Coordinates of C-alpha atoms in Angstrom, one line a residue:
Chain A
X1 CA 23.9 -24.2 -13.8
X2 CA 21.9 -21.6 -15.6
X3 CA 21.6 -17.9 -14.5
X4 CA 18.9 -16.9 -12.0
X5 CA 15.5 -15.9 -13.4
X6 CA 14.4 -12.3 -13.6
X7 CA 12.6 -10.4 -10.8
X8 CA 9.1 -11.4 -10.2
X9 CA 5.9 -9.3 -10.7
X10 CA 5.2 -6.2 -8.6
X11 CA 3.3 -7.0 -5.3
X12 CA -0.2 -6.1 -4.4
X13 CA -1.3 -2.5 -3.5
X14 CA -1.4 -1.8 0.2
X15 CA -4.6 -1.6 2.1
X16 CA -6.4 1.8 2.4
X17 CA -5.3 4.1 5.0
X18 CA -7.1 4.7 8.3
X19 CA -9.8 7.5 8.9
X20 CA -8.5 11.0 9.1
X21 CA -8.4 13.2 12.3
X22 CA -11.7 14.5 13.6
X23 CA -12.8 17.8 12.1
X24 CA -12.7 21.2 13.9
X25 CA -15.3 22.0 16.6
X26 CA -18.7 23.4 15.6
Chain B
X1 CA 18.8 -25.2 -14.5
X2 CA 18.7 -21.6 -13.1
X3 CA 17.2 -20.7 -9.7
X4 CA 14.1 -18.4 -9.5
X5 CA 14.7 -14.7 -9.9
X6 CA 14.8 -12.2 -7.0
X7 CA 11.4 -11.3 -5.6
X8 CA 9.3 -8.8 -7.5
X9 CA 9.2 -5.1 -6.5
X10 CA 7.1 -4.1 -3.5
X11 CA 3.5 -3.1 -4.4
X12 CA 2.2 0.5 -4.4
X13 CA 1.4 2.3 -1.2
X14 CA -2.3 2.0 -0.4
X15 CA -4.8 4.8 -1.2
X16 CA -5.3 7.6 1.4
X17 CA -7.8 6.9 4.1
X18 CA -11.3 8.4 4.1
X19 CA -12.3 11.8 5.9
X20 CA -12.3 11.6 9.6
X21 CA -15.2 12.0 12.0
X22 CA -17.1 15.2 12.3
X23 CA -15.8 17.6 14.8
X24 CA -17.6 18.2 18.2
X25 CA -20.8 20.2 18.2
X26 CA -20.4 23.8 19.3
Chain C
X1 CA 18.9 -22.4 -19.1
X2 CA 17.9 -19.2 -17.1
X3 CA 15.7 -19.6 -14.2
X4 CA 11.9 -18.7 -14.1
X5 CA 10.6 -15.4 -13.0
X6 CA 10.5 -14.9 -9.3
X7 CA 7.3 -14.9 -7.3
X8 CA 5.2 -11.8 -6.8
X9 CA 6.8 -9.1 -4.6
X10 CA 5.7 -7.9 -1.2
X11 CA 2.5 -6.1 -0.6
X12 CA 2.6 -2.3 -0.5
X13 CA 2.5 -0.3 2.8
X14 CA -0.9 0.8 4.1
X15 CA -2.1 4.2 2.8
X16 CA -1.7 7.3 4.8
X17 CA -4.3 8.5 7.3
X18 CA -7.3 10.3 5.7
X19 CA -7.9 14.0 5.5
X20 CA -9.5 15.8 8.5
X21 CA -13.3 15.3 9.0
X22 CA -15.8 18.1 8.4
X23 CA -16.4 21.0 10.9
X24 CA -18.9 20.1 13.7
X25 CA -22.5 21.2 13.6

């Protein structure tokens, strides 16, 4: 049997992060 | 007849999220 | 014969939470 193939391509980038914390009070 | 290679590397972390909500009115 | 390339890797983690919002009005 032949050797295993090489590692595959890199995966997709993750989804964008959630909105940040609320700003400071007025 | 080699098997498929190991899975590719994990993708990049997603981009930082957008700015948060405005702070409370003062 | 060597095997073919593996399939695409796992998706990346979600990005970090965003920066703080603007000061209030």
